[PDB]
Amino acid sequence: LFIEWL
Amino acid sequence: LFIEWL
């Protein structure tokens, strides 16, 4: 599971 | 920016 917020 | 990989 990969999550990114930028 | 939101990125999800499951």
Residue numbers in the entry:
A (entry chain B), B (entry chain A): 1 to 6
From the article:
Here, we identify an evolutionarily conserved hexapeptide sequence as the major aggregation-prone region (APR) of gastrointestinal peptides of the glucagon family: xFxxWL. We determine nine polymorphic crystal structures of the APR segments of glucagon-like peptides 1 and 2, and exendin and its derivatives. We propose that the pH-dependent changes of the protonation states of glutamate/aspartate residues of APRs initiate switching between the amyloid and the folded, monomeric forms of the hormones. Our results highlight the dual role of short aggregation core motifs in reversible amyloid formation and receptor binding.
Two polymorphic crystal forms could be grown from solutions of APRex-4. In polymorph B of the same system, shifted interfaces could be found which are stabilized by different interactions. A lateral shift between adjacent β-sheets allows the formation of 3 different interfaces (S1, S2, and S3). S3 is stabilized by the hydrophobic interactions of the Leu, Phe, and Ile side chains, plus the intersheet Glu–Glu side chain H-bonds. An aromatic cluster is formed in both polymorphs of APRex-4. At pHs where Glu/Asp side chains become protonated, charge frustration ceases as side chains establish intersheet H-bonds. For example, protonated Glu forms H-bond either with the opposing Glu (S1 of polymorph A, S3 of Polymorph B in APRex-4 Fig. 6c), or with the indole rings of Trp(s) (S2 of Polymorph B Fig. 4e). Polymorphs formed in pure aqueous solution are laterally displaced, as the side chains of Tyr, Glu, and Gln rather form H-bonds with the surrounding water molecules. Aromatic side chains form intrasheet aromatic ladders in the two parallel structures of APRGLP2 and APRTc5b (polymorph D), as well as in both polymorphic structures of APRex-4. Interestingly, exendin-derived hexapeptides showed the greatest structural plasticity that is reflected in multiple β-sheeted conformers giving rise to several polymorphs.
